[PDB]
UniProtKB/TrEMBL annotation:
Glycosyl hydrolase family 13 catalytic domain boundaries: 10-355
Protein name: Alpha-amylase
Family statement: Belongs to the glycosyl hydrolase 13 family.
Species of the source: Pyrococcus furiosus
Organism superkingdom: Archaea
């Protein structure tokens, strides 16, 4: 990648959103963006589930039917998936790799959908568990491969009424990751580097752990919950990272309601994954399932200058927000955002913190303002004592430099938070001359 690599905590782009334009144009559409995203500093792209789903052309991939059909067989009323054909996906991955950008596969293995009606001896009724007709002829299945069966009735969880996969069966283990004919093998064979595990609360952490033991690669599990202990327990057991839903909700509490203290408190008392283990936290401002944060500018300013590994939501970058502001924060994240964090000021609508720097990144000062007016504060930042600091976003309307006296005191300023009028509510500072 241009700046930091995925394995180095680089920024990730969720290259989709709920119900992207159909017609099989998504893979090509994303492929055309690779050169721009490379220049923007994106280190990896997370793609939606690539397999043929029950709802065919309308499927978002979360109702997988034939895992081994990436848009190559006429099935469920279509050859290509909603996103495109197999080759288009392969070409996308090849283009990403040509630019050193990694690709993350969205693995949906808790459930399956689109099976034929079949008598189920354990349910005592008919179930849509007959998957013997999948066009790929790979990973066929019947009621024995789902809950309930002769092993047990249920596992950690189900999703709606979709046939719930029993990973304890060797047949299913073989087809999903335990062989060179597995779904993991197939995804890896076409270029996928990492994994994003869907609804991990629906099955055991051991599944992800064994998958990773066999294939390695960067990984994150989607464990939708606010209980940090539960998320970190799953993370340490599975060996994968977890999306920081706890931080997501706390950022919303603070940034969308002039309640910064709510976020400070959460960060101080372990109510976020990132404040407990920044090496396990995958941070985000929004995703395809939930998007409650309205004031996204200070939110992105925060996850891109604070600790953890940030993800940028496709729609914010390509449709709703000022792309240049995001490109700027990615540059800042990879060049300045390093080291431990020290909060130096806060009130209901303002948050100022310092990143103390690491071996490659000098550190920075983030000044978030949720108020509708220009603000300025005298702050004690000994980290930058006796230095020339520069504002790196340009949100002050121009090129601005300041001298932090030998003591550590400096008068910092932040623009109004009125994005509707081009005032984004944040300024970011660091040593002059970095980039
Ligand atoms: O400026 C705008 C956008 O912000 C968010 O991302 C909302 O979810 C979206 O509905 C809105 O259009
Ligand atoms: Ca399950
Ligand atoms: Zn096509
Ligand atoms: Zn089971
Ligand atoms: Zn909100
Ligand atoms: Zn673009
Ligand atoms: Zn204030």
């Amino acid at each position: 990648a241009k700046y930091l690599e995925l394995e180095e905590g680089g920024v990730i782009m969720q290259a989709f959103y709920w119900d992207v334009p159909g017609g099989g144009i998504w893979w090509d559409h994303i492929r055309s963006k690779i050169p721009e995203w490379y220049e923007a500093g994106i280190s990896a792209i997370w793609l939606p589930p690539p397999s043929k789903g029950m709802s065919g052309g309308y499927s978002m991939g979360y109702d997988p039917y034939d895992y081994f059909d990436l848009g190559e067989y006429y099935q469920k009323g279509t050859v290509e998936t909603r996103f495109g054909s197999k080759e288009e996906l392969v070409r996308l991955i090849q283009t990403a790799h040509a630019y050193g950008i990694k690709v993350i596969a969205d693995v949906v293995i808790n459930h399956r959908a689109g099976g034929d009606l079949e008598w189920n001896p354990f349910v005592g009724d008919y179930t849509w568990t007959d998957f013997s007709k999948v066009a790929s002829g790979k990973y066929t299945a019947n009621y024995l491969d789902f809950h309930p069966n002769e092993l047990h009735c249920c596992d950690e969880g189900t999703f709606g009424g979709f046939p719930d996969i029993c990973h304890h069966k060797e047949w299913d283990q073989y087809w999903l990751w335990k062989s060179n004919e597995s779904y993991a093998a197939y995804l890896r064979s076409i270029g996928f580097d990492g994994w994003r595990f869907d609804y991990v609360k629906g099955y055991g952490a051991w599944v992800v752990r064994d998958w990773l033991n066999w294939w390695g690669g960067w990984a994150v599990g989607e464990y939708w919950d606010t209980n940090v202990d539960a998320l970190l327990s799953w993370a340490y057991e599975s060996g994968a990272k977890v999306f920081d839903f706890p931080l997501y909700y706390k950022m919303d509490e603070a940034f969308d309601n002039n309640n910064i203290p709510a976020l400070v408190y959460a960060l101080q008392n372990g109510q976020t994954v990132v404040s407990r283990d920044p090496f396990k936290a995958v941070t985000f401002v929004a995703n395809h399932d939930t998007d409650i944060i309205w004031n996204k500018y200070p939110a992105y300013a925060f996850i891109l200058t604070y600790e953890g590994q940030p993800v940028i939501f496709y729609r914010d970058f390509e449709e709703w927000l000022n792309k240049d502001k995001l490109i700027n924060l990615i540059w800042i994240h990879d060049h300045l955002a390093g080291g431990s964090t020290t909060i130096v000021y806060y009130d209901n609508d303002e948050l100022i913190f310092v990143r103390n720097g690491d071996s490659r990144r000098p550190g920075l000062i983030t000044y978030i303002n949720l108020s509708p007016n220009w603000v300025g504060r005298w702050v004690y930042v000994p980290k930058f004592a006796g230095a020339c600091i520069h504002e790196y976003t340009g949100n002050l309307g121009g090129w601005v430099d300041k001298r932090v006296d030998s003591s550590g005191w400096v008068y910092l300023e932040a623009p109004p938070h009125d994005p509707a009028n081009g005032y984004y509510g944040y300024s970011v500072w660091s040593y002059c001359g970095v980039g």
